[PDB]
């Protein structure tokens, strides 16, 4: 009846990527006028830190090597308001449909 990583990691992603997480990303996007490549980088830097802070080193290394192989780390969905990007949700994994900002935890 086992529980594989994909569930555990997606569950962590829902805990980490809150409204307050998106708030910070959206700020850096306007303040520093980032393109998609820069915003994505900033998005993943902040995800990886919050993940590491939550599960510590040994699990972090498990989950990152699991993502390299099965693409289980979230990707941001950005829209362009006139050269200023806004993150409006995430694809939690490769296989899972998008979650919009309105449906993320406060
Ligand atoms: Cl959904």
Swiss-Prot record:
What does the record say about domains? The DNLP motif has IFN suppressive functions like binding to host MAP1B.
Instruction: Name one matching Pfam family.
Output: RSV_NS2
Q: How does it assemble?
A: Monomer (instable). Homomultimer. Heteromultimer with NS1. Interacts with host RIGI (via N-terminus); this interaction prevents host signaling pathway involved in interferon production. Interacts with host MAP1B/microtubule-associated protein 1B.
Q: Which gene encodes it?
A: 1B
What organism is listed for this UniProt entry? Human respiratory syncytial virus
Name the UniProt record assigns to this protein: Non-structural protein 2
Please tell me which stretches of this chain the record labels as motif DLNP: 103-106
Q: What is its main location?
A: host cell
What family classification does the UniProt entry report for this protein? Belongs to the pneumovirus non-structural protein 2 family.
Q: Which domain of life is it from?
A: Viruses
Kindly state which keywords UniProt assigns to this record, in alphabetical order: Host mitochondrion, Host-virus interaction, Inhibition of host innate immune response by virus, Inhibition of host interferon signaling pathway by virus, Inhibition of host IRF3 by virus, Inhibition of host IRF7 by virus, Inhibition of host RIG-I by virus, Inhibition of host RLR pathway by virus, Inhibition of host STAT2 by virus, Inhibition of host TBK1 by virus, Inhibition of host TLR pathway by virus, Interferon antiviral system evasion, Modulation of host cell apoptosis by virus, Viral immunoevasion
Q: Which residues form the signal peptide?
A: none
Stated role: Plays a major role in antagonizing the type I IFN-mediated antiviral response. Acts cooperatively with NS1 to repress activation and nuclear translocation of host IFN-regulatory factor IRF3. Interacts with the host cytoplasmic sensor of viral nucleic acids RIGI and prevents the interaction with its downstream partner MAVS. Together with NS2, participates in the proteasomal degradation of host STAT2, IRF3, IRF7, TBK1 and RIGI through a NS-degradasome involving CUL2 and Elongin-C. The degradasome requires an intact mitochondrial MAVS. Induces host SOCS1 expression.
Q: Biological process (GO) annotations? A: symbiont-mediated perturbation of host apoptosis; symbiont-mediated suppression of host cytoplasmic pattern recognition receptor signaling pathway via inhibition of IRF3 activity; symbiont-mediated suppression of host cytoplasmic pattern recognition receptor signaling pathway via inhibition of IRF7 activity; symbiont-mediated suppression of host cytoplasmic pattern recognition receptor signaling pathway via inhibition of RIG-I activity; symbiont-mediated suppression of host cytoplasmic pattern recognition receptor signaling pathway via inhibition of TBK1 activity; symbiont-mediated suppression of host JAK-STAT cascade via inhibition of STAT2 activity; symbiont-mediated suppression of host toll-like receptor signaling pathway; symbiont-mediated suppression of host type I interferon-mediated signaling pathway
Q: Which InterPro entries match?
A: RSV_NS2
Which Gene Ontology CC terms are recorded? host cell mitochondrion
Compartments annotated for it: namely: Host mitochondrion
């Amino acid at each position: 009846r086992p529980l594989s990583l994909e569930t555990t990691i997606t569950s962590l992603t829902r805990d980490i990527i809150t409204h307050r997480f998106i708030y910070l990303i959206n700020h850096e996007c306007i303040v520093r006028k980032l393109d998609e490549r820069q915003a994505t980088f900033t998005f993943l830097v902040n995800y990886e830190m919050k993940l590491l802070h939550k599960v510590g080193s040994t699990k972090y290394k498990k989950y990152t090597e699991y993502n390299t192989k099965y693409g289980t780390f979230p990707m941001p969905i950005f829209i362009n308001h006139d050269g200023f990007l806004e993150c409006i949700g995430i694809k939690p994994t490769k296989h899972t449909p998008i979650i919009y900002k309105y449906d993320l935890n406060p």
